[PDB]
Amino acid sequence: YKMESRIKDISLAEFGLQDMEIAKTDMMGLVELQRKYRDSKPLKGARITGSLHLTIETSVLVETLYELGAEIRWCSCNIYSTQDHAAAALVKKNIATVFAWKNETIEDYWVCLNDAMTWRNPNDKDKICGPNLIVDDGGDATLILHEGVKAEIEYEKYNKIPEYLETELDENGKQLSMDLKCMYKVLKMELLKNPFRWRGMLKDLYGVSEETTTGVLRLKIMESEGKLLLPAINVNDSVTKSKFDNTYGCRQSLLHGLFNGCIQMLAGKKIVVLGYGEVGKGCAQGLSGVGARVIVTEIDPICALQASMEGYQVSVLEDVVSEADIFITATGNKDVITVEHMRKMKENAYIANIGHFDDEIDVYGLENYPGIKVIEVKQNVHKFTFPDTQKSVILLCKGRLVNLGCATGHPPLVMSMSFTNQVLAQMDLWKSRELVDRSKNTRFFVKKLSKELDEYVARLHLDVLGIKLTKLTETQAKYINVSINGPYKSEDYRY
Amino acid sequence: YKMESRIKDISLAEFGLQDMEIAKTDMMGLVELQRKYRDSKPLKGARITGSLHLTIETSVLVETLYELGAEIRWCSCNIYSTQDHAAAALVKKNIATVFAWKNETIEDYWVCLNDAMTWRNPNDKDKICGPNLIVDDGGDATLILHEGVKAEIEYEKYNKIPEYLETELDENGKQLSMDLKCMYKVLKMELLKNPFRWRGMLKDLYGVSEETTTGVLRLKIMESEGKLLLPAINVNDSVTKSKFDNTYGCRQSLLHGLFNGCIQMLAGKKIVVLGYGEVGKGCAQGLSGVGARVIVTEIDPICALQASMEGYQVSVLEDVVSEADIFITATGNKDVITVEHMRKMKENAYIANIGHFDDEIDVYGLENYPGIKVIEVKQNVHKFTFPDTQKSVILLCKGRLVNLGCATGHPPLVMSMSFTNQVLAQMDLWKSRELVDRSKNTRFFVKKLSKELDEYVARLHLDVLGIKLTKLTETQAKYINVSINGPYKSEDYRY
Amino acid sequence: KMESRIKDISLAEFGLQDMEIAKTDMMGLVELQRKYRDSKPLKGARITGSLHLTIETSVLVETLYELGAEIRWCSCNIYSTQDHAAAALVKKNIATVFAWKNETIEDYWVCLNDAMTWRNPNDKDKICGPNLIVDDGGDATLILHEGVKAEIEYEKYNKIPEYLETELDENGKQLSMDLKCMYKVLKMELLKNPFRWRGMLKDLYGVSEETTTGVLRLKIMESEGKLLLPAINVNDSVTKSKFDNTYGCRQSLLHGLFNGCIQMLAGKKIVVLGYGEVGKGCAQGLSGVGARVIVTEIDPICALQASMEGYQVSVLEDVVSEADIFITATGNKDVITVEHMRKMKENAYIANIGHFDDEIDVYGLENYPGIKVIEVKQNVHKFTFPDTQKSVILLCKGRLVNLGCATGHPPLVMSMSFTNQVLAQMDLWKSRELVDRSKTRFFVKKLSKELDEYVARLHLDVLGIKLTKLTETQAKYINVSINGPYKSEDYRY
Amino acid sequence: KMESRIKDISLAEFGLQDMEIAKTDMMGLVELQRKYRDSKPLKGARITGSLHLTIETSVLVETLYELGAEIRWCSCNIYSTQDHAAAALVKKNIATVFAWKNETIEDYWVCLNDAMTWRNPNDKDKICGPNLIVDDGGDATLILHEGVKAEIEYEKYNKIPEYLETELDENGKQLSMDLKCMYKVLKMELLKNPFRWRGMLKDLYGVSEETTTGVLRLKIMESEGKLLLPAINVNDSVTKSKFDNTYGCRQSLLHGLFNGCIQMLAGKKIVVLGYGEVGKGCAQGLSGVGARVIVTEIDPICALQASMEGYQVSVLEDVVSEADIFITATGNKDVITVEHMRKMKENAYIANIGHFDDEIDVYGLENYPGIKVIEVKQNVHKFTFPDTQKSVILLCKGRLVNLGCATGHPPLVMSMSFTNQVLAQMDLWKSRELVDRSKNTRFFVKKLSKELDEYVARLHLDVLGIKLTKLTETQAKYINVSINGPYKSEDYRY
Ligand SMILES: NC(=O)c1ccc[n+]([C@@H]2O[C@H](COP(=O)([O-])OP(=O)(O)OC[C@H]3O[C@@H](n4cnc5c(N)ncnc54)[C@H](O)[C@@H]3O)[C@@H](O)[C@H]2O)c1
Ligand SMILES: Nc1ncnc2c1ncn2[C@@H]1C[C@H](CO)[C@@H](O)[C@H]1O
C-alpha cells in the first residue's frame, strides 16, 4: 500500500501541522471560512487542482478547500518554493494528493504538474479525467492545458507528432528554455498515451482563479485573442490582494530572502530596485527601513515620479551598473539584467529576482558564458566568475523569486488576505458551473470579485491587529452617498 | 463689481510677478503648454470663469489659459485662500478680471463668485451673458449655476420669489449655514434683475473641469439623477492629480499649515488623522516625518488596514478624544468632530481641517455655544474656552482647509501636475463644443482624461527632478504586451 | 518701559497669550516658577541676556524674574526677535528690553551694550555691570573680553588703540561689519569711561552659554588662560544637545524652508553640510517630507553615521552643480564660497542653520562686481551673476534660517534647554562667594547628570510617558540607584 | 587538550568561501593583515578567546593569527556558533577550537576551560595560561577570577570550599545552571592542581572586552580593587557602540525574528524593553517593516528620546495583555516574569537580545508545575500553561535571538568592532613590560583613543563609496582642530 503522493519526507508532518496552527492565529480569513462553511460544504464534489508554492500558508488554503468539501491534487509553481514540512502535513492528514518538494529539477516540475492535473475516474470504470477547478499562480497549470489542446488539434491534422514539440530550436533558431523543453516532452508523452486527454477535460472544467500579476497578463492575452478555454477570476487585482500581498508582503519577505542569501549588511549600500510597481514599492520601502540607499529604474513616467516623491534616485541601469552593490529585479519583464550588464558589475555584487519567472535576469546566458567558473556558496546561492576579468557576481537561487527561494515567502497575515480571495473565487466559479455551456462557441472571460467581497476580506482581518472601525451615521452616509455597510469607494478608487 | 477687478492691493503686483517666475522653474507642465500652444491659441474666443484658490500657482494657471487665447474672470473658492500679491499680479499685467482677496466675509465671497460668472458681450448690445467654460474647485460655481436654474423654474411656476430663498430655516427647523443664506441672497437679487440669467448662460456653456474630490462627489450625484446640465471633466481622479496633489501635496502643506498656526512641537504628540484616504495618507506620512505619533480613524476597512500596515494605531474618536493632542479632519464628510467631542478634549488641544469644506468640524456649534469665551491668538487662529470646565481648544482658521488658510497650500511642482490636467481638460471641453447640442440632449455626464494624457503630464515634470526614464526594447514591449511609447498599464491599475 | 527700545508695545497682548499657550508644554519652567517663586533664590541678582528674544525666551525671562532677578535683555541675532514677545515682557515690567526684528548691525551692538549697562541701585547715578550673563553665541561674553583688552591697551599707550580705528585687517581685507560696529561701540565707551569694563569684573560672578559655537569660544579662552569669569556649558547637557540641536531643527528647519523657499522639497537633492547634532536633525526632517539628502563631512565617524541612515556622502565640489538646495550646519567658515555659488543651477536655494553667517560667503556674494540683487520677499534675496546670467536665492542673508525665516524651535525642546539655563544661573549665583579676584584662572564646567535627568523628568507628563521603576534587585544587578543616575559620565545616549 | 572539539570538519570548505566573501566589506581587518602580517606585532603571544564563533569572528581569529599569535578559542553562548566557521579555522590550523552550535551548559564551561588551558612544550608538557584574552560577556574573565578566589579559599581551610559543592546560593535559592557548571569545573581543577589559576597570573597581560554587560562586570571589579589584569573596554569605542549595538541590531534582530517568528511584523504591537543603544536599533528596524513599537524605560532621558521618534512609552503591566511580541534589550534581570507571561495573549512571541538569558525568567517558565512544552522548530519552543491552556512562544530559550535564531550582525559592523579588538590586543601586548606582579598593584579599565577610533572609521569609508571632505588651513584653525583630527572633544556624544 504505497502512497501516490511524491514528497521529500512524510515524518516531517507533525512540524508542518504545528506551524499551520500557529499561522492560523493570524489567518482569520481562512479560519472564518472553515467555521462558517464546513457544515454546508459548498465545494462538495469539486475536484480542485492547484499549482501554487506549497508553503505553510498554502497548506491552510488547501485545508480550507478540503473542509469546504473538495477533493484536492496539488503541486508548486516553482522548483525552490516548496516547504517539505508543509507538504507532509497535507499527505499525513489525507487532505490532498501532493506532487511537490524543495529543489526539484525542471523536469520534475513538469511531471508533478501533469500528475496533479491527472484524475482517476472513480465509479465510472477508472481511466483519465481532469479537474473541475484550478488554483493557479503564474499560469503554468493554465498553459499546459491550453498547449495540450493546441498539440492535440495539431496532432490530428497530420496524424503524427507536431514538429515543434520534438525540436530543441524555436522560431528564431536559438535554444528553447528548459521549462519549454520539459513541457513539450510531457505533451509528446501524453499524445502517445491518449490524444483526447486535454480536450476531454474541458467538458467538466468550470474555471480557474489566478493569483499573480504575470498569470493575469497571460490570461488577458488569451481573452483578447479569443483563445481562453475556461472562465477565469483575477484574484491578484483585488484591493485586499495587490495592495497588501504584492507591496507589504514583499517589504518583509524580500528582506528575509536577502538576509538568508546575502551575508552582507544592506545599510549604506546602493541597492537598485528595477521596477517600481506594486512589488517594487514594497521592496524599496523595506530596504530603506534597514538603511539602504535605494536607486530605482522605471519605464513608466508615473511610477518614476512616485519613487522620486519617496526620496529615491531614478536612473537607467547602464549609469549605475558599475557602482551599485545589489540588484533586485521586480519588473515581470525579460532581459532586464543581461550578461553584458553583469560583466560590468563590481566584485561580489549580488543579483536577485523577486518577479515570478527567471526571465528577468539572463541566467541561461550567464551559466553558458564560455569558460564561466561557478561555485555553490550555500544552498541556493552561487558565485559566478568571468574568465577574462576574474571578477565575480553572486546570484541568489538561480534567478527564481528570492523571497520564496531563499526564504519562506510572505507571512500568514497577508497570505490569508490573498487566499481568502482564492476560496471566494473558487466558490464563485463552482456555484456558476451551470452557465458554462460547451455547445455554442461562447468565448470565456476574465472577471474580478466584487468590491463588496473585497471589503469583506478586509473586515475579517481587523481583529488580528486590534483595529477599531468607525461607523457612519445615516446623515453622514447620505452626505457622502454610500450605504452604512458599504461599499465606501467608487469602482475606480486607487487606495 | 462689473468689468473692473476687485482686489486688496494692486501695489503688491511686483512681488506676485517675481514669485510667479520662481515658481515656474518647477511648473514645467504649464511652461511647456505655453511654449507649445501660445501661437496657435486653441482657446481663442473662450470665456473662462474660474472658482479656485487664487495662489501664486493658480496665477500661472490663469496665465497659461490666457496665453492660449482665453478671456478670463476669476475668484477664489475659499474666504482665506487667496494670496493678495498673486491676485495683484493678474490684474497688473491685465491677464484676467479678478474678484478675490484674503479674509473675505461669506457675503462678499458669493458676490465675488456671482461677479466672476457675469460677462458683457460687446457685440450683442452689451447684454449680460455667461462663461463658455468653468474651472471649478469644490463645485460652488457649478452649484450657483444649477441652483440658479432651479430658482428660475420655481420662480415661473408661481410668478414669485420661492419661499426657500427668503426663510433662514431648512426642512428640519435648524438655522441654514451662512454659505447657503449668502448664496440664496445672491440668487434672489438676480431673480429681480433678470429671471432668465442662469438659463441664458446654459446656451453658451460648453463645460466644467473639477479639481477636488468633494466637487467630483457633487458631480457624480447630479449625473446619476440626470441633473448635470453641462459636460464635466473629473481632473481630481487623474493619476497625476490624485496620487500626487492629494497625498504628497498635503505631506508638505499640512505641516506648513500647522507650523504657522500651531506653536507646539509635533514630536511625540498623539495626533489624530480622521480619514485615511488620499489626503490622510499624506498627512500621516508628514506628521510621522517630524516625530508625531499618528492615530487614525476610518470607516473603510481596507483603508483601516492600510493605516495599520504603516504602523499606525486605528481607533474610533471616542476612545482617544480625551488623551489626544491635535486633531486633523481629512474625510470630506460632516460632523466628524462635534461640540460634545470638543468638550472632552484636554487643555489646549489643537483642531484643524484639511478637507474642502468646514462641515467636518461643528464650528457653528462651538462659536454659538452658550457662554463660550473666544479670543484671537493670531490671524486666523482662535482659542475657545468653555465656561463649565474652563478648558480651552484652539481652532485653526475656523475649520477651513488649514494648508491654504494658515499657509500657502501645496508647492508648485504638484500644482503644475494638477493644473496641466486642468488646461488639457479645458482644451478638450472647448474642442468638442460642437457635439453639445441642446435641441437634442440637455443632460450630460462626467468623464476623466485618458491614460495617454495622464502619462504625458508625468513626462513633462521628469527633468525637474533629474529623473532618467528607461526605454523598452521591442522584445520587452512585446513580452509585457504594451507599446514602447505607452500606455504602460491597464485602465484598472492602481499605482 | 522707560529705558526699553522695542518696535510696538500694542503687540504685548498677543505675546502674553502665546506665552500661556507655550507654557502648556514648557513644564520645566512652570515647575521652577511654582517651586522657587516664594523663596526667590536669585533675589537681588542683576542678569543680562543676549539670546533670540522669542516667545520661548520670554518664558525664560519670566522664570528668572519670578525667582527674584532684575533683568535687561537683547537678541543674539538681528532677525530672530519676535516683536510681540519683546512687548509682552516690557508691558509686564519683567525686564528692560533692547531688541526688535530686522535690526541693523550697528543697532545690534548698541542694544547689547545697553543691556550690559546698569545704573548703580539707589546709591548714586554711576554706571556698573551685571552679576550674571545668559549668552547664546558668545557675543555678550566677547564684548566684555574685548572691552577689557581695549582698556588695558588704552592705558599702556595713553591713547585709543589703532586696531579700533582701522577698517582693514591683517592682510588688507575689509573687516566684518560685526567687528566694525563692536569696535565703534568700544571706542565710544573708552572716551566716556576707560574703567567701565574692568569695573564690571568686581561683581561679575558667571555666564551660562547656550550653543555649540559659543562654547568653542569659551574653551579657547579657558585654554589660553584669558577667561575672566566662571562659565557653565549648557549646550553639552544631554537634555539640551540631544533634543534642542537635533529634534528642534528637525521641525524648525522645515518651518524656515517652507516660509523662505516656495518650492517642493520632495524629490529634490538637498545637500546638508555637516552631520553633527544639528545636521542629523536637518536630514531626518528633510527625508520625512521626501527629500533626497546628500551629506558632506570632515569627520569619518559622522560620515559613516550618515551612510548608515541611507544618505549619500560626497564632497560639495562633486554635487554643487546638480543639487537643488544647500543647508550649511557645520559651525565653520567658508563652507560655501562664491566659486561654488557660480557653479549652482538656476534658482538654487542656499541657507544656513549654524549660529553665525560665516558659513556662507555672503559678503563676497553681495559685493561681487556686477551682481544684481532683488528682494523676493521678507529676508529672501535673489542674486544674479553678470556673466552667466544665472541666479541663486539666499535665505535671510546667511543668518540662522529657522529663527531668521521662521520662529525657531518649538516650546517643548526650548523648555528643556531653558530649564538647564535657569539651573546654571542658580548654580553660578549660589557660588558667588568663591569668586575671589585677588590671588586665579576661571574654568568652564557642566551641570551634573542628576540635574540632567531631573530636566527630563519634568517633561515626561507633557507626552504621556509612563516611566518604569527598578526593583532593588534590578538596581543592584545593574549597579545603580533606583533614583538614578542610570548611566556613566561617558554614556553617549 | 591539544586537539579541537567541533561538529563537522567537512563543513570547512563552505566556511572558507563565506570568509572570503565577508572580507569584501571587512576592510578594517584586511588592512591590518596587509600592514602587519610581515612585522608580526603579536609574535609569540598566546591568546584565548570567548566570543561567538561566527564567520565574522573567524576573520578576527585569522587576523590575530596573521599577526603572529597562537590561538585557542570557544563561543560565549551555547547557540551562537556557526559550525562551518569553526571548521574553517581547524582546517587551516589557524587556531584550536572548542565550539559547536547547541552546546549543553555543561559542555560550555568545559570548552571555555579547555580554551584557557595551554600546554607549554618548553617545560616537558606542563599546564599554563594565556597571555591575552578576547572576551565577550566576561565569562573568560569570570572563570579566571572565580578560579583564583576558589584557590585562596581552598588553601585557607585546606579543603574544597562548601560554596562549590551545593545547589543553593546565599539565601537558599537554587543556583543558575551556569554557576553550578562553572563551579563543577573549578572544583575539578582544585583536585588536579590548586595552584593552576594563580599560576596563570604570572604571564597574563590583559583582556579586551567586547560588550556592555562584560564591561559592567569589569568596572565593578575595578572599583572594588579586585581586577587581576589590565583591561580594555572595546564596547565604548565610538566605532563599536554607535554601529554594532545600534545598526547591527537594526538588521540582525529582524533576521532572528524572521527565522524564529513565522508571523507578519507589520501592524503588530511589539514591545521593546530598554531604549539604550541596542533598543534604539531594534525599534528602528521594527518600524522599518511596519510594526508599532512600544518602549519601556527606567531612564527618563532615554524615554524622551523614544517619544521624540514617535514611540509610545509604557510600563510592561499596562501592555502585557494586548502586545503581540516582546523583545528584551535591557542587560538587566527579571524584566519579563512568569506572572507577566501568564497574562499574555495566545501565541505571543518573546525574545531577548541582551547578552545573557536572565532578562526573561526562563527557568521559572520551564519548571512551572504542569507546563507543557513542544519544539516548533530549531531553537523555538511553545509553552502552554495547564490552568488557562494559553501559550507563549519563546525564541532560543531566551538567549540572544539575533545570534541564536540567525547569524548575528553582518560583516561591515563586525569589522569595525573587531578592528578595535585587534588594536586593543596589540596595545595590551606592547605594554606587557608595564605589568609588575611582584608588588600587588591595582589594574584599571581604559578605552582606546579617539585617534584610533577615527582611524577605524577611515578604514571602512571605501566600502560604501563615502567621499570625505578635507579641512583647509583656515577652517581647521577656526574650529580649533588639526586637519588630520581628532575632530571632536572627548565628551562628544555623536
Ligand atoms: N545581541 C547583540 O548582538 C548585542 C549587541 C550589543 C549589545 N548587546 C547587549 O544588549 C544589552 C544592552 O546593551 P546596550 O548597549 O543597549 O546597553 P545600554 O545601557 O545602552 O541600554 C540598556 C537600557 O536598558 C534600560 N533598562 C535597564 N533596566 C530596565 C528595565 N527593567 N526596564 C526597562 N528598561 C531598562 C536602561 O535605562 C538602558 O537605557 C547588553 O546586555 C549588551 O551586552 C547585545
Ligand atoms: N556575527 C557576529 N559575530 C560575532 N559577534 C557578534 C556578531 N553579531 C553580534 N556580535 C556581538 C555579540 C555581542 C553581545 O554578546 C555584541 O557586543 C556584538 O559585538
Taking the mean position of all CA atoms in its chain, how far away is CA D434? 28
A481 Ramachandran zone, left/alpha/beta (phi>0; psi -120 to 50) = left
B248-409 topology per CATH: Rossmann fold (3.40.50)
Q: For residue C380, which of C389, C365, C399, C393 has the smallest C-alpha distance?
A: C393
Which atom of ligand 2 sits closest to the CA of residue D54? 3
Phi and psi, residue A160, nearest 5°: -155, 170
Q: Do D21 and A256 touch (CB under 8 A)?
A: no
Of C292, C297, C313, C314, which to mutate for an interface test with A (greatest number of A Cβ within 10 Å)? Answer: C292
Give strand pairing partners of B207.
B133
- Judge if the beta carbon of residue C474 lies within 6 A of ligand 1: yes
Side-by-side strand order, sheet with B293-297:
B313-314, B293-297, B270-274, B326-329, B349-353, B392-396, B381-385, B373-378
Cβ distance D175 to D135 under 8 Å?
A: no
C1-246+409-466 topology per CATH: Rossmann fold (3.40.50)
A442/D331 Cα distance (integer angstroms) = 71
Neighbours of D454 (CB within 10 A): 19
Instruction: Extract the C-alpha cell encoding C482.
Output: 533606583
Instruction: Extract the C-alpha cell encoding D424.
Output: 586593543
Q: For residue A222, which of A151, A145, A113 has the smallest C-alpha distance?
A: A145
Instruction: Extract the C-alpha cell encoding D387.
Output: 490552568
Ranges of beta strands (E only) in D245-371 are: 269-273, 292-296, 312-313, 325-328, 348-352
Q: For residue A432, which of A228, A207, A196, A109 has the smallest C-alpha distance?
A: A207
Q: Which residues of B are catalytic?
A: 53, 76, 81, 137, 211, 236, 241, 245-246, 250, 356, 410, 418, 422
Q: For residue C113, which of C79, C140, C77, C87 has the smallest C-alpha distance?
A: C140
Q: For residue C243, which of C416, C79, C60 has the smallest C-alpha distance?
A: C416
A106/A76 Cα distance (integer angstroms) = 12
- Eight-state DSSP code of residue C299: -
Phi and psi, residue D22, nearest 5°: -60, -35
Local structure of B233: helix, strand or coil: strand
Instruction: Extract the C-alpha cell encoding B343.
Output: 468638550
Size of chain D in residues? 494
The end-to-end CA distance of chain C, in Å, is 45
A267/B354 Cα distance (integer angstroms) = 37
B235/A153 Cα distance (integer angstroms) = 51
Instruction: Extract the C-alpha cell encoding B223.
Output: 449625473
B350/C158 Cα distance (integer angstroms) = 64
CATH classification (class only), D247-408: alpha beta
Half-sphere exposure (CA, 13 Å, Cβ side) for C6? 28
Instruction: Extract the C-alpha cell encoding A167.
Output: 525540436
The dihedral built from the CA positions of residue B463, B467, B468 and B473, taken in this order, carries a sign that is: negative
Q: How far is CA B443 from CA B140, B142, B200, B211, B230, in A?
A: 19, 14, 16, 21, 7
- Nearest Cβ partner for B470 among A297, A465, A472: A297
Ordered DSSP codes for D164-185: TS-SB-TTS-BPPHHHHHHHHH
- Eight-state DSSP code of residue B360: G
D154/D172 Cα distance (integer angstroms) = 22
Cβ distance C305 to D242 under 8 Å?
A: yes
- Judge if the beta carbon of residue D417 lies within 6 A of ligand 1: no
The end-to-end CA distance of chain A, in Å, is 54
Instruction: Extract the C-alpha cell encoding B124.
Output: 450683442
Q: Do A255 and D250 touch (CB under 8 A)?
A: no
C429/D261 Cα distance (integer angstroms) = 58
Which residues, 6+ apart, have CB-to-CB distance to A196 below 8 Å?
A: A152
Strands D206-209 and D132-135: parallel
Size of chain A in residues? 495
Greatest Cα pair distance, chain C, in angstroms, is 75
Best mutation site among D212, D234, D313 for ligand 1 pocket (most ligand atoms within 8 Å of CB): D212
C118/C343 Cα distance (integer angstroms) = 51
Alpha helices in B225-277 (DSSP H): 239-241, 250-261
Minimum-distance ligand to the CA of D235? 2
Phi and psi, residue A380, nearest 5°: 60, 35
What is the count of residue pairs from A and C with beta carbons less than 8 Å apart?
Answer: 32
Q: Is D352 annotated as a binding residue?
A: no
CA of C490 to the centre of ligand 2 (A): 22
Give strand pairing partners of D447.
D233
Cis peptide, bond prior to residue A487, ω within 30 of zero: yes
Phi and psi, residue A335, nearest 5°: 55, 45
Cβ distance B281 to B243 under 8 Å?
A: no
Cβ distance A355 to A257 under 8 Å?
A: no
Q: For residue A137, which of A419, A361, A379 has the smallest C-alpha distance?
A: A419
Phi and psi, residue B96, nearest 5°: -160, 165
Give strand pairing partners of B474.
none
Cis peptide, bond prior to residue C485, ω within 30 of zero: yes
Q: Is B338 annotated as a binding residue?
A: no
Of C340, C468, C471, C472, which to mutate for an interface test with D (greatest number of D Cβ within 10 Å)? Answer: C468
B169/A188 Cα distance (integer angstroms) = 82
Nearest CA to ligand 2 atom 15: D355
Name the catalytic one among A114, A260, A285, A422. A422
B392/B396 Cα distance (integer angstroms) = 13
Half-sphere exposure (CA, 13 Å, Cβ side) for C16? 14
B244/C92 Cα distance (integer angstroms) = 49
Q: Do D292 and B313 touch (CB under 8 A)?
A: yes
Instruction: Extract the C-alpha cell encoding B333.
Output: 464628510
Local structure of B338: helix, strand or coil: coil
C326/C348 Cα distance (integer angstroms) = 8
Cβ distance B36 to B128 under 8 Å?
A: no
Which residues, 6+ apart, have CB-to-CB distance to D180 below 8 Å?
A: D167
Which architecture does CATH list for D1-246+409-467? Answer: 3-Layer(aba) Sandwich (3.40)
Neighbours of C230 (CB within 10 A): 20
Q: 3-state secondary structure string, chain A?
A: CCCCCECCCHHHHHHHHHHHHHHHCCCHHHHHHHHHHCCCCCCCCCEEEEECCCCHHHHHHHHHHHHCCCEEEEECCCCCCCCHHHHHHHHHCCCCEEECCCCCCHHHHHHHHHHHHCEECCCCCCCEECCCEEEECCCHHHHHHHHHHHHHHHHHHHCCCCHHHHCCECCCCCECCHHHHHHHHHHHHHHHHCCCHHHHHHHHCCEEEECCHHHHHHHHHHHHCCCCCCCEEECCCCHHHHHHHHHHHHHHHHHHHHHHHCCCCCCCCEEEEECCCHHHHHHHHHHHHCCCEEEEECCCHHHHHHHHHCCCEECCHHHHCCCCCEEEECCCCCCCECHHHHHHCCCCEEEEECCCCCCCECHHHHHCCCCCEEEEEECCEEEEECCCCCCEEEEEHHHCEHHHHCCCCCCHHHHHHHHHHHHHHHHHHHHCHHHCCCCCCCCCCEECCCHHHHHHHHHCCCHHHCCCCCCCCHHHHHHCCCCCCCCCCCCCCCC
Q: How would you label C406-440 residue by residue, b for 16+ Cβ within 10 Å and e otherwise?
A: bbbbbbbbbbbbbbbbbbbbbbbbeeeeebeeeee
C297/C276 Cα distance (integer angstroms) = 9
Give strand pairing partners of B169.
B175
Phi and psi, residue C303, nearest 5°: -65, -50
Cβ distance D6 to D395 under 8 Å?
A: no
Sort out which chain A residues have CB atoms less than 8 A from B421's CB and list them: none
Q: For residue C146, which of C114, C190, C208 has the smallest C-alpha distance?
A: C190
Q: Is C297 annotated as a binding residue?
A: yes
- Nearest Cβ partner for D376 among A22, A407, A465: A22
CATH classification (class only), A1-247+410-468: alpha beta
Instruction: Extract the C-alpha cell encoding B337.
Output: 468632530
Nearest CA to ligand 2 atom 5: D52
B96/B72 Cα distance (integer angstroms) = 5
**Domain assignments of chain D as residue spans, ordered by start:** 1-246+409-467, 247-408
Phi and psi, residue D426, nearest 5°: -60, -35
Size of chain B in residues? 495
Q: Do D478 and C332 touch (CB under 8 A)?
A: yes
Sort out which chain A residues have CB atoms less than 8 A from B222's CB and list them: none
Q: Do C334 and D305 touch (CB under 8 A)?
A: no
Ordered DSSP codes for C52-96: ---HHHHHHHHHHHHTT-EEEEE-SSSS---HHHHHHHHHTTS-E
Cβ distance A251 to D290 under 8 Å?
A: yes
Q: Which residues of C are catalytic?
A: 52, 75, 80, 136, 210, 235, 240, 244-245, 249, 355, 409, 417, 421
Please indicate whether the domains covering C1-246+409-466 and C247-408 agree at the CATH topology level: yes
Neighbours of A86 (CB within 10 A): 30
Backbone discontinuities in chain C, residue before each (C to N > 2.5 A)? 439
Q: In chain C, which residue's Cα lies nearest the Cα of A284? A: C310
Which residues, 6+ apart, have CB-to-CB distance to B352 below 8 Å?
A: B257, B258, B261, B262, B326, B327, B328, B329, B395, B396, B397, B399, B402, B406
What type of residue is D147? G
- Eight-state DSSP code of residue D102: S
Cβ distance A32 to A64 under 8 Å?
A: no
